Amino acid sequence: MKKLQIAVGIIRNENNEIFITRRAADAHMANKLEFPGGKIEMGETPEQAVVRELQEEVGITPQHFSLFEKLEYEFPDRHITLWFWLVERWEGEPWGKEGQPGEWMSLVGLNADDFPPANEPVIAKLKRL
Numbered sequence: 001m002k003k004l005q006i007a008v009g010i011i012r013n014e015n016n017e018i019f020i021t022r023r024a025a026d027a028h029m030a031n032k033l034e035f036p037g038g039k040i041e042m043g044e045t046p047e048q049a050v051v052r053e054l055q056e057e058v059g060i061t062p063q064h065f066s067l068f069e070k071l072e073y074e075f076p077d078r079h080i081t082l083w084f085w086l087v088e089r090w091e092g093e094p095w096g097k098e099g100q101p102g103e104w105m106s107l108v109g110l111n112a113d114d115f116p117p118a119n120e121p122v123i124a125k126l127k128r129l
């Protein structure tokens with residue numbers, strides 16, 4: 001009955017663009033282009049879980065918050081929770097420590113192909129823009 005939670009937030013840049021985390025560059029499933037905010041589970045609260053890990057996945061001081069969308073799905077004995085928060089701004093550059101360096105990209109062209117298919121229902125909403 002293991003349940004793993006995940007909280008993410010698309011950081012908004014100075015040009016209506018957000019920085020997402022990609023699987024570096026191939027050699028590790030390049031089609032898993034996801035976003036920061038992993039390990040929020042631990043033992044935090046639905047609200048403090050992201051807010052705390054946020055510093056861990058951004059480290060900087062960004063005007064980040066809001067909830068764009070949230071998806072809750074369960075895998076064969078593995079409950080995977082994915083929370084999508086709506087970020088509005090970020091000072092300097094996002095660093096934190098997620099494990100996959102990112103760059104300021106435009107979400108206007110987000111793709112369900114580049115990202116992990118495990119979170120399509122969520123992207124299906126924003127993808128349509």
Ligand SMILES: Nc1nc2c([nH]c(=O)n2[C@H]2C[C@H](O)[C@@H](COP(=O)(O)O)O2)c(=O)[nH]1
Nearest residue numbers: 004005006037038039040041080081098099
């Ligand atoms: N299918 C799959 N899921 C993974 C891998 N690594 C990994 O972290 N995950 C999962 C578990 C987490 O709940 C979520 C976010 O990353 P973390 O495990 O690093 O926090 O995605 C992996 O190699 N394969």
Ligand SMILES: [Mg+2]
Nearest residue numbers: 038039056098
């Ligand atoms: Mg983390």
